[PDB]
RNA sequence: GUAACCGGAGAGGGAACCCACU
């Protein structure tokens, strides 16, 4: 779910960046370091809207580097066990369906797929379809989904979803 | 660095930004003799050193 | 990988993976060459520079011109026992090449080692793979490689190029049925190469290679000098596109130009998304200015070339040897 | 212990302000306009691009004033702060659908009021 | 412009006692 939180971070600056514009370089360093980053505790940090405060930087003893404690407002994405959000299909596969949510990618398994959603290998695009042929889940479709479990991989979050729940399907 | 360790007014090691340590006294390949502004060089003690 | 000739597929040439025969072929190639180390036993030229060009006046030379091809060694040891070797020491088996013995045309060559290239030559709009025999190493247990260079050239001619033509004259060998043509690379005196550079083939020439008249020596042969146009330059760089941002430094992405046998970045390149496709791949680069820049990516090669190779090419490109630059240098003699 | 149905959130994460897809888009488009101008800046991340196109295709109402209007009107009624954005993103068409999607509202408010709020939401839908 | 042919490998115990130096 998308949020607006204030975060704390400390950035070391090499002495060559002091210049006549130190705060601008501080802003750029914080952007380049926490833009697109992922944390298992707080989820995806999509973007930093503003920097709340830049504290007094302490010169490290014996090292030219200076660290600034920085307060900044950033928008985060960390999904729940128990939240429901709409997702978009990226790949149809016999093991399961690959669907894309924001930055994160989750898959729905066949046993989690309701038994009505039969396989159609022979359709020119592989499809998830009923015997009644009403619901057609296909590549690039937007669907409802119920994310049950999340995993952290190389400090990047991937999750898994369920689709058994009622009303949860094609938009 | 070009003088090296054999001649006295020279260097023993040259440390690069990655932390890679090059030993100047054992046949350094002419490629890594070249140095940039970020590196550190371990020169011998010279006149005026404290 | 194992690709005989890139661009055109040749029938009957078959790469061999069978370890028992691969080992015998490679080891007895080393035996024929008297080669100390492992790998490719053949003589390897070096790039010409200001120091190299001096060697031309110290001793007589023979001249030929480099044409686009791959370094490739034919070992002839029987009727079908022809195993075919490149710079990577890979071995291919060729079927239909038959090498008649000059005295007995029914007898076929054995224990013969040739030096040559696979060059694609388009004649009548069709690509004809050709083999140019510029040197011979071994011949029927005779140490022809220890003979003079002109002597070896005449052995090439009389013992190989003529008996085969003798047998196509009688029809017992069909030129159409052989997988690719076999010829000898032409050689001239140093005076003749001056006409090559009123040069009407200035665009059709890839460079020059100079051959001393001395005895054959394996591996790196310092007095065999290749001339390569400087504007047309050129090493295989193993590239790791790396986001190298030091501690306290703004993160930066750069392309590190590695070479063979040297654990550190030999040089750096202006990394770019249009260069990101060939991540961790062997590439050639051009050092026009102080920046090496990319021309083509070599999927065939897997290893970067050696550090000494990098040094030699850097020296050569630093002293750009041009056609007009050596034209007068030989015209004075 | 962290469950959206039973409303357990981390203490460090309790006070955060939740956002809509449309207002996330306006913020990200503001950042995109900031970065395209004032050159010599780092190229935006693949995460940024994915979130931008996601919230573009998932933008309910484009109008900026509509965002403030729906936020204010829904917060005027006493509801938990996490529910505002999830309700406005999902946009249920029936109160049964709304209670099925978010079990917390089940029993929190009556059917008529919940359906009136939902109908206002679809009314401000663009 | 070859399968770098090894990659420069140096780190080399310790405890005890004795003598000696400032």
XYZ file of C-alpha atoms (C1' of nucleotides) in Angstrom:
702
model
C 0.000 0.000 0.000
C 1.212 3.519 -0.820
C 2.168 5.783 2.076
C 3.850 9.082 2.965
C 6.452 8.602 5.704
C 9.426 10.530 7.082
C 12.695 8.616 7.243
C 16.144 8.968 8.804
C 19.384 8.337 6.923
C 23.056 9.309 7.162
C 25.157 9.932 4.042
C 28.946 10.171 3.901
C 30.402 12.870 1.639
C 33.880 12.756 0.150
C 35.787 16.018 0.773
C 35.837 16.766 -2.964
C 32.062 17.411 -2.888
C 32.277 20.242 -0.348
C 32.597 22.894 -3.070
C 30.371 25.963 -3.120
C 27.293 23.715 -3.356
C 27.413 21.117 -0.588
C 23.701 20.875 0.224
C 22.791 20.278 -3.426
C 25.312 17.428 -3.568
C 23.836 16.097 -0.309
C 20.382 16.114 -1.911
C 21.716 14.372 -5.019
C 23.529 11.728 -2.956
C 20.418 10.984 -0.919
C 18.314 10.739 -4.087
C 20.780 8.445 -5.858
C 21.076 6.236 -2.775
C 17.432 5.896 -1.676
C 15.680 6.180 -5.058
C 14.491 2.792 -6.264
C 15.873 1.162 -3.120
C 14.010 -1.592 -1.292
C 13.903 -2.511 2.388
C 12.162 -5.539 3.836
C 11.083 -3.539 6.885
C 9.619 -0.511 5.074
C 9.080 -1.815 1.542
C 9.805 -0.063 -1.721
C 10.909 3.565 -1.524
C 9.425 4.891 -4.762
C 10.425 8.550 -4.558
C 11.464 11.264 -2.122
C 9.066 14.208 -2.260
C 11.045 16.550 0.003
C 13.883 16.576 2.524
C 12.559 17.595 5.934
C 15.868 18.453 7.604
C 19.609 18.129 7.016
C 21.469 17.984 10.309
C 24.936 19.143 11.254
C 27.535 16.984 9.543
C 30.238 15.485 11.751
C 33.779 15.159 10.430
C 34.902 11.586 10.994
C 38.092 11.433 13.093
C 40.945 10.188 10.938
C 38.758 10.207 7.813
C 37.900 13.044 5.462
C 34.307 11.866 5.125
C 31.432 13.804 6.692
C 28.091 12.204 7.565
C 24.859 14.204 7.594
C 21.790 12.921 9.468
C 19.025 13.715 6.982
C 15.259 13.907 7.475
C 13.227 13.396 4.310
C 9.656 12.623 3.266
C 9.367 9.632 0.943
C 6.528 7.569 -0.507
C 6.743 3.860 0.273
C 5.141 0.632 -0.971
C 5.086 -2.353 1.372
C 2.273 -4.906 0.883
C 0.282 -6.707 3.558
C -0.759 -10.172 4.476
C -4.440 -9.386 3.996
C -4.619 -6.480 1.559
C -6.358 -6.506 -1.831
C -5.063 -4.490 -4.791
C -5.566 -4.673 -8.550
C -2.780 -6.255 -10.609
C -1.795 -6.578 -14.277
C -0.813 -9.799 -16.068
C 2.671 -10.093 -17.588
C 2.989 -13.786 -18.472
C 0.765 -16.853 -18.790
C 2.521 -20.068 -17.800
C 1.494 -23.619 -16.986
C 3.018 -23.431 -13.501
C 1.076 -20.236 -12.845
C 0.260 -16.706 -13.946
C 2.778 -13.851 -13.721
C 1.246 -10.489 -12.777
C 2.868 -7.130 -12.077
C 2.055 -4.797 -9.156
C 3.764 -1.400 -9.012
C 7.445 -2.256 -8.811
C 6.877 -5.722 -7.353
C 6.013 -8.927 -9.212
C 3.893 -11.733 -7.762
C 2.582 -15.006 -9.184
C -0.682 -16.912 -8.710
C -0.389 -20.695 -8.572
C -2.695 -23.206 -10.249
C -3.868 -24.718 -6.958
C -4.553 -21.188 -5.724
C -6.271 -20.522 -9.066
C -9.936 -21.595 -8.827
C -10.623 -24.817 -10.708
C -12.991 -23.015 -13.099
C -10.027 -21.181 -14.689
C -9.034 -23.993 -17.021
C -5.892 -23.904 -19.147
C -5.895 -23.085 -22.859
C -2.468 -23.905 -24.290
C -4.013 -24.120 -27.775
C -5.348 -20.551 -27.825
C -2.882 -18.452 -29.831
C -2.131 -16.514 -26.647
C -2.129 -18.877 -23.648
C -5.232 -18.194 -21.610
C -7.016 -18.846 -18.334
C -10.641 -19.583 -19.152
C -13.797 -21.216 -17.828
C -15.743 -24.135 -19.231
C -18.564 -21.614 -19.711
C -15.995 -19.541 -21.675
C -17.140 -16.322 -19.971
C -14.028 -15.164 -18.082
C -10.932 -14.767 -20.273
C -7.726 -14.110 -18.320
C -4.968 -13.343 -20.813
C -1.735 -11.381 -21.259
C -1.850 -7.687 -20.245
C -5.184 -8.047 -18.411
C -5.872 -6.107 -15.212
C -7.152 -8.300 -12.379
C -8.037 -8.184 -8.711
C -5.697 -10.159 -6.464
C -5.267 -11.119 -2.801
C -1.624 -11.066 -1.681
C -1.053 -13.535 1.150
C 2.713 -13.850 1.549
C 5.803 -11.743 0.933
C 9.475 -12.676 0.555
C 12.686 -10.629 0.583
C 15.268 -11.409 -2.110
C 18.593 -9.536 -2.176
C 16.886 -6.812 -0.110
C 14.144 -6.681 -2.778
C 10.578 -7.695 -1.960
C 8.653 -10.294 -3.942
C 5.275 -11.604 -2.843
C 2.746 -14.337 -3.602
C -1.010 -14.024 -3.956
C -4.289 -15.920 -3.607
C -7.294 -15.821 -5.943
C -9.786 -18.161 -4.234
C -11.624 -15.271 -2.572
C -14.983 -14.094 -3.899
C -15.365 -11.267 -6.455
C -11.565 -11.451 -6.909
C -10.803 -11.661 -10.610
C -10.868 -9.861 -13.931
C -11.865 -6.200 -13.797
C 56.530 5.625 -8.342
C 58.568 5.365 -11.545
C 61.712 5.421 -9.399
C 60.208 2.679 -7.245
C 61.445 0.865 -4.169
C 64.979 0.068 -5.378
C 66.051 3.706 -5.541
C 65.789 5.256 -2.086
C 63.726 8.413 -2.831
C 60.811 6.341 -4.087
C 57.686 4.404 -3.130
C 56.956 0.944 -1.735
C 53.219 0.527 -2.414
C 50.543 2.363 -4.376
C 47.001 1.957 -3.034
C 44.022 2.505 -5.328
C 40.475 3.597 -4.506
C 39.171 0.014 -4.572
C 41.764 -0.768 -1.898
C 43.866 -2.853 -4.286
C 47.492 -2.803 -3.123
C 50.228 -2.867 -5.776
C 53.755 -3.813 -4.707
C 56.346 -1.689 -6.503
C 59.402 -3.782 -5.615
C 58.482 -6.937 -7.586
C 58.301 -6.235 -11.346
C 55.238 -3.961 -11.566
C 53.600 -4.145 -14.971
C 53.810 -0.728 -16.680
C 49.999 -0.530 -16.834
C 49.326 -0.085 -13.113
C 52.248 2.303 -12.625
C 49.789 4.927 -13.881
C 47.915 6.670 -11.075
C 44.868 8.923 -10.698
C 43.997 11.623 -8.173
C 42.134 9.321 -5.779
C 44.971 6.918 -5.062
C 47.405 6.757 -2.150
C 51.130 6.108 -2.544
C 53.372 4.794 0.246
C 56.556 6.772 -0.313
C 59.701 6.262 1.724
C 60.541 8.567 4.602
C 62.057 11.774 3.244
C 63.657 14.952 4.546
C 61.220 17.042 6.554
C 58.984 14.133 7.535
C 57.708 14.415 11.098
C 32.799 -21.818 -29.312
C 33.529 -24.228 -32.171
C 32.780 -22.461 -35.470
C 34.966 -23.374 -38.450
C 34.343 -20.323 -40.655
C 31.922 -17.600 -39.605
C 29.573 -16.373 -42.327
C 29.559 -19.424 -44.624
C 28.900 -23.056 -43.717
C 31.233 -25.535 -45.421
C 30.065 -29.091 -46.071
C 32.137 -32.006 -44.811
C 34.049 -30.039 -42.171
C 33.152 -31.539 -38.796
C 34.327 -30.351 -35.399
C 35.518 -33.259 -33.257
C 34.972 -33.506 -29.494
C 36.247 -37.091 -29.071
C 38.980 -36.826 -26.450
C 41.170 -39.789 -27.597
C 41.721 -38.365 -31.094
C 41.696 -34.726 -29.936
C 44.539 -35.471 -27.532
C 46.624 -37.270 -30.144
C 46.095 -34.546 -32.755
C 46.934 -31.703 -30.369
C 49.939 -33.437 -28.796
C 51.470 -34.442 -32.121
C 50.885 -30.906 -33.410
C 52.967 -29.779 -30.429
C 55.508 -32.468 -31.340
C 55.726 -31.280 -34.956
C 56.127 -27.651 -33.894
C 58.534 -28.368 -31.032
C 56.294 -26.051 -29.028
C 57.059 -25.567 -25.335
C 53.718 -24.507 -23.861
C 50.160 -25.623 -24.461
C 47.600 -24.265 -26.896
C 48.288 -23.016 -30.397
C 51.847 -23.997 -31.424
C 52.008 -21.857 -34.563
C 54.136 -18.776 -35.072
C 52.398 -15.601 -33.908
C 53.253 -12.238 -35.522
C 53.676 -8.955 -33.660
C 52.494 -5.473 -34.581
C 54.990 -3.182 -36.301
C 56.341 -0.057 -34.601
C 59.283 2.351 -34.877
C 61.564 -0.310 -33.374
C 60.171 -3.140 -35.514
C 60.480 -1.283 -38.837
C 64.254 -1.169 -38.342
C 64.464 -4.959 -38.725
C 63.579 -4.676 -42.428
C 66.966 -3.188 -43.389
C 68.965 -5.560 -41.157
C 67.907 -8.655 -43.118
C 66.049 -9.496 -46.364
C 62.293 -9.989 -46.224
C 59.356 -11.340 -48.215
C 56.034 -9.495 -48.334
C 52.352 -10.403 -48.473
C 49.182 -8.488 -47.527
C 46.691 -9.449 -44.821
C 43.189 -10.363 -46.002
C 40.235 -10.964 -43.683
C 40.545 -14.537 -42.430
C 40.958 -16.704 -39.351
C 44.230 -18.283 -38.223
C 43.984 -21.965 -39.075
C 46.416 -24.915 -39.243
C 46.010 -27.984 -41.477
C 47.621 -31.182 -40.199
C 47.775 -33.724 -43.043
C 48.462 -37.242 -41.760
C 46.494 -39.597 -44.023
C 43.815 -40.092 -46.657
C 40.993 -38.948 -44.362
C 43.327 -38.107 -41.455
C 43.187 -34.333 -41.855
C 42.521 -32.555 -38.585
C 42.175 -28.849 -38.789
C 43.437 -26.469 -36.098
C 42.849 -22.793 -35.210
C 44.402 -20.308 -32.788
C 42.137 -21.593 -30.006
C 43.673 -25.098 -30.463
C 40.247 -26.444 -31.487
C 40.372 -29.301 -33.997
C 38.038 -29.958 -36.935
C 37.888 -33.035 -39.169
C 37.641 -32.453 -42.924
C 36.497 -35.267 -45.215
C 37.162 -34.745 -48.912
C 40.582 -33.042 -48.922
C 43.028 -35.446 -50.572
C 46.732 -34.560 -50.789
C 48.512 -36.540 -53.523
C 52.138 -37.548 -53.122
C 54.243 -36.147 -55.952
C 56.056 -39.384 -56.830
C 53.086 -41.745 -56.360
C 49.799 -39.965 -57.073
C 47.963 -42.929 -55.513
C 49.866 -42.326 -52.257
C 48.580 -39.647 -49.893
C 50.510 -37.275 -47.653
C 51.232 -38.138 -44.027
C 52.897 -36.295 -41.137
C 52.498 -32.981 -42.965
C 51.718 -29.678 -41.234
C 50.683 -26.560 -43.163
C 50.131 -22.942 -42.143
C 47.296 -20.972 -43.683
C 43.963 -19.213 -43.345
C 40.254 -19.607 -43.934
C 39.420 -16.561 -46.056
C 36.028 -15.989 -47.656
C 36.534 -14.773 -51.225
C 33.445 -13.669 -53.144
C 33.871 -14.415 -56.855
C 30.963 -14.083 -59.293
C 28.897 -12.841 -56.362
C 29.256 -16.140 -54.473
C 31.324 -16.709 -51.333
C 34.104 -19.222 -52.049
C 35.995 -20.305 -48.895
C 39.705 -20.502 -49.692
C 42.858 -21.682 -47.923
C 46.087 -19.787 -48.617
C 49.243 -21.766 -47.833
C 51.801 -19.160 -46.783
C 54.073 -21.507 -44.806
C 54.734 -25.219 -44.286
C 55.928 -26.658 -40.984
C 56.351 -30.418 -41.408
C 56.537 -32.790 -44.396
C 56.686 -36.623 -44.333
C 58.900 -36.655 -41.216
C 61.343 -34.368 -43.033
C 62.224 -31.189 -41.061
C 61.287 -28.825 -43.894
C 60.529 -26.190 -41.256
C 64.264 -25.893 -40.591
C 64.870 -25.112 -44.277
C 65.031 -21.605 -45.741
C 61.807 -19.661 -46.267
C 62.056 -19.709 -50.070
C 62.874 -23.421 -49.892
C 59.712 -24.019 -47.858
C 57.702 -21.951 -50.344
C 58.952 -24.132 -53.199
C 58.166 -27.272 -51.183
C 54.637 -25.907 -50.709
C 54.285 -25.295 -54.432
C 55.862 -28.416 -55.931
C 54.740 -30.960 -53.323
C 51.170 -29.757 -52.703
C 49.738 -27.345 -55.253
C 51.044 -29.229 -58.293
C 50.136 -32.915 -57.577
C 46.549 -31.961 -56.826
C 46.258 -30.044 -60.106
C 47.823 -33.073 -61.790
C 44.983 -35.202 -60.451
C 42.189 -32.791 -61.407
C 43.745 -32.723 -64.896
C 43.030 -36.473 -65.132
C 39.692 -36.150 -63.315
C 40.593 -38.354 -60.334
C 40.026 -35.311 -58.082
C 36.980 -33.090 -58.637
C 37.380 -29.419 -57.726
C 33.600 -29.140 -57.312
C 33.422 -31.953 -54.732
C 35.995 -30.558 -52.359
C 34.542 -28.505 -49.477
C 36.777 -25.473 -50.073
C 39.593 -24.328 -52.327
C 43.255 -24.774 -51.399
C 45.889 -22.342 -52.686
C 49.210 -20.812 -51.683
C 49.375 -17.214 -50.501
C 51.415 -15.180 -53.024
C 54.747 -13.717 -51.943
C 56.837 -10.910 -53.428
C 59.980 -8.926 -52.675
C 59.940 -5.772 -50.541
C 60.186 -3.643 -53.690
C 56.892 -4.990 -55.064
C 54.881 -3.987 -51.977
C 55.587 -0.325 -52.787
C 53.226 -0.546 -55.762
C 50.589 -1.853 -53.340
C 50.790 1.492 -51.504
C 49.216 4.710 -57.739
C 47.617 2.167 -55.397
C 44.232 1.181 -56.842
C 43.663 -1.467 -54.142
C 44.078 1.001 -51.275
C 40.516 0.259 -50.104
C 40.705 -3.476 -50.857
C 43.812 -3.962 -48.673
C 43.567 -4.664 -44.940
C 47.273 -4.165 -44.240
C 50.653 -5.790 -44.755
C 52.477 -8.723 -43.173
C 56.250 -9.080 -43.575
C 57.934 -12.491 -43.510
C 61.661 -12.921 -42.809
C 63.583 -15.460 -44.853
C 64.857 -17.195 -41.707
C 63.916 -20.565 -40.286
C 60.508 -21.241 -38.763
C 60.125 -20.509 -35.055
C 56.959 -21.226 -33.043
C 55.008 -18.860 -30.844
C 55.810 -15.165 -30.646
C 58.226 -14.368 -33.484
C 59.449 -10.807 -33.022
C 60.736 -10.179 -36.567
C 57.452 -11.150 -38.269
C 55.818 -7.722 -38.461
C 52.202 -7.071 -39.424
C 51.312 -3.635 -40.792
C 47.854 -2.411 -39.819
C 46.447 0.960 -40.940
C 46.161 3.243 -37.898
C 42.822 4.812 -38.852
C 41.534 1.272 -39.466
C 42.471 0.089 -35.955
C 41.859 -3.033 -31.687
C 42.016 -5.582 -28.861
C 39.554 -8.026 -27.313
C 38.280 -6.296 -24.155
C 36.420 -8.274 -21.519
C 33.973 -5.677 -20.210
C 32.248 -5.474 -16.831
C 29.799 -2.581 -16.806
C 30.076 -1.635 -13.154
C 28.377 0.920 -10.906
C 31.604 1.987 -9.194
C 30.721 4.587 -6.592
C 33.361 4.890 -3.904
C 32.649 5.459 -0.238
C 31.532 9.045 0.246
C 31.338 9.445 -3.547
C 28.282 9.868 -5.743
C 27.526 6.448 -7.281
C 28.781 6.262 -10.857
C 28.527 3.594 -13.547
C 31.580 2.975 -15.741
C 32.765 0.313 -18.147
C 35.958 -1.414 -17.022
C 38.102 -2.635 -19.932
C 39.751 -5.808 -18.667
C 42.423 -7.796 -20.505
C 43.799 -11.334 -20.265
C 45.877 -12.249 -17.244
C 45.679 -8.823 -15.561
C 43.230 -8.766 -12.651
C 42.592 -5.013 -12.756
C 40.763 -2.646 -15.127
C 43.233 -2.007 -17.927
C 41.255 1.050 -19.043
C 37.830 2.688 -18.855
C 35.186 3.412 -21.479
C 32.352 5.923 -21.692
C 29.640 3.466 -20.665
C 26.283 3.909 -22.384
C 22.913 2.158 -22.568
C 23.468 1.547 -26.293
C 26.596 -0.293 -25.123
C 24.824 -2.093 -22.253
C 23.505 -4.951 -24.430
C 26.799 -6.879 -24.451
C 27.101 -7.062 -20.678
C 30.098 -9.207 -19.673
C 31.097 -9.961 -23.277
C 34.334 -9.906 -25.282
C 34.552 -6.820 -27.510
C 36.925 -4.954 -29.802
C 37.591 -1.258 -29.194
C 39.149 1.609 -31.169
C 41.631 4.034 -29.566
C 41.268 7.019 -31.879
C 41.491 9.602 -29.067
C 42.442 8.850 -25.441
C 39.129 6.940 -25.313
C 38.695 3.350 -26.476
C 35.382 3.068 -28.344
C 33.387 0.043 -29.481
C 33.100 -1.223 -33.060
C 31.976 -4.860 -32.933
C 31.292 -7.590 -30.385
C 33.079 -10.928 -30.813
C 30.756 -13.708 -29.679
C 33.236 -16.289 -30.989
C 35.963 -15.289 -28.530
C 35.505 -15.932 -24.808
C 38.804 -14.730 -23.314
C 40.304 -11.233 -23.481
C 43.662 -11.054 -25.193
C 46.855 -10.978 -23.171
C 48.434 -8.085 -21.298
C 51.498 -8.135 -23.553
C 49.112 -7.986 -26.515
C 47.477 -4.920 -24.983
C 50.901 -3.320 -24.508
C 51.965 -4.056 -28.089
C 48.746 -2.656 -29.550
C 48.962 0.444 -27.336
C 52.503 1.139 -28.537
C 51.483 0.521 -32.154
C 48.489 2.861 -31.963
C 50.604 5.475 -30.166
C 52.986 5.509 -33.111
C 50.585 5.449 -36.095
C 52.467 3.836 -38.981
C 50.878 4.976 -42.230
C 51.287 3.840 -45.825
C 52.998 7.090 -46.816
C 55.057 6.826 -43.628
C 56.755 3.594 -44.714
C 56.475 4.087 -48.493
C 59.381 6.550 -48.518
C 61.170 4.542 -45.809
C 61.562 1.656 -48.253
C 61.875 3.868 -51.352
C 65.136 5.214 -49.932
C 66.552 1.692 -50.391
C 0.348 -10.132 13.977
C 0.254 -7.601 11.132
C -3.223 -7.930 9.617
C -5.103 -5.394 7.514
C -8.463 -6.858 8.565
C -7.820 -6.479 12.308
C -5.896 -3.182 11.889
C -2.490 -3.997 13.377
C 0.249 -1.757 11.972
C 3.880 -1.268 13.045
C 4.386 1.380 15.709
C 7.090 3.068 13.625
C 4.706 2.864 10.644
C 1.524 3.863 12.513
C 1.579 7.627 11.885
C 2.249 7.545 8.129
C -0.224 9.255 5.787
C -1.681 6.882 3.191
C -1.970 7.930 -0.465
C -4.147 7.434 -3.541
C -3.038 6.282 -6.981
C -4.106 9.591 -8.550
C -2.238 11.777 -6.057
C 0.752 9.450 -6.270
C 0.621 10.078 -10.022
C 0.504 13.841 -9.581
C 3.492 13.694 -7.215
C 5.443 11.415 -9.571
C 4.606 13.607 -12.576
C 5.786 16.627 -10.593
C 9.051 14.773 -9.951
C 9.274 13.832 -13.644
C 8.820 17.471 -14.670
C 11.429 18.456 -12.075
C 13.968 15.970 -13.444
C 13.377 16.572 -17.168
C 14.172 20.226 -16.493
C 17.390 21.170 -14.675
C 19.571 18.809 -16.683
C 22.717 16.920 -15.631
C 20.676 14.733 -13.269
C 20.480 10.969 -12.853
C 18.101 9.052 -15.104
C 14.923 7.941 -13.354
C 14.771 4.361 -12.134
C 12.912 1.437 -13.662
C 10.971 1.333 -10.391
C 9.960 4.957 -10.978
C 8.838 4.172 -14.533
C 6.856 1.098 -13.451
C 5.102 2.974 -10.654
C 4.379 5.898 -12.988
C 2.755 3.816 -15.724
C 0.949 1.676 -13.137
C -0.641 4.708 -11.486
C -1.327 6.252 -14.900
C -3.376 3.247 -15.984
C -4.826 2.975 -12.451
C -5.694 6.678 -12.093
C -9.372 6.953 -11.161
C -9.949 10.715 -11.463
C -7.428 13.064 -13.063
C -8.660 16.281 -11.432
C -6.511 17.553 -8.570
C -9.331 19.346 -6.734
C -11.395 16.147 -6.844
C -8.673 14.440 -4.785
C -8.959 17.037 -2.021
C -12.762 16.989 -2.206
C -13.059 13.209 -1.842
C -10.388 13.123 0.875
C -12.132 15.818 2.922
C -15.651 14.435 2.491
C -14.651 10.896 3.422
C -12.508 11.954 6.397
C -15.367 14.094 7.730
C -17.087 10.796 8.492
C -15.324 8.979 11.321
C -13.259 6.226 9.692
C -9.782 4.821 10.201
C -7.098 6.569 8.160
C -5.871 3.431 6.366
C -9.338 2.748 4.951
C -9.717 6.067 3.094
C -7.178 5.340 0.380
C -7.931 1.638 -0.054
C -11.646 2.388 -0.453
C -10.960 5.173 -2.938
C -8.567 2.992 -4.971
C -10.875 -0.033 -5.085
C -14.036 2.054 -5.681
C -16.653 -0.602 -4.828
C -20.021 -0.182 -6.516
C -22.100 -1.884 -3.796
C -21.768 -1.837 -0.021
C -21.708 -5.645 -0.022
C -18.710 -5.419 -2.356
C -17.095 -2.830 -0.079
C -17.504 -4.984 3.033
C -16.255 -8.052 1.145
C -13.138 -6.199 -0.018
C -12.420 -4.596 3.373
C -13.810 -6.658 6.282
C -13.143 -3.831 8.759
C -16.129 -1.796 7.539
C -18.394 -4.815 8.098
C -20.463 -3.647 11.059
C -18.691 -0.286 11.345
C -21.417 1.625 9.482
C -24.891 0.904 8.170
C -25.664 -0.216 4.630
C -27.397 3.016 3.602
C -24.560 5.295 4.738
C -21.889 3.025 3.249
C -23.707 2.925 -0.091
C -24.187 6.706 -0.022
C -20.438 7.172 0.487
C -19.733 4.731 -2.350
C -22.207 6.538 -4.619
C -20.476 9.839 -3.862
C -17.182 8.156 -4.779
C -18.543 7.052 -8.160
C -20.107 10.508 -8.567
C -16.672 12.126 -8.313
C -15.226 9.427 -10.586
C -13.951 10.990 -13.806
C 45.592 -11.306 -31.138
C 46.620 -19.442 -28.471
C 43.430 -23.421 -23.404
C 47.825 -16.299 -18.847
C 52.152 -21.773 -18.332
C 51.456 -21.789 -11.385
C 48.153 -16.612 -9.591
C 55.364 -12.780 -7.360
C 53.678 -18.249 -3.104
C 56.810 -13.906 1.781
C 52.931 -14.868 7.939
C 58.678 -18.226 9.623
C 55.176 -22.531 15.931
C 55.045 -21.635 21.015
C 56.709 -22.033 25.862
C 60.669 -22.122 29.462
C 65.294 -20.601 31.257
C 69.956 -18.042 30.788
C 73.138 -14.056 29.476
C 73.466 -9.144 28.098
C 72.167 -3.824 26.703
C 70.027 1.405 28.433
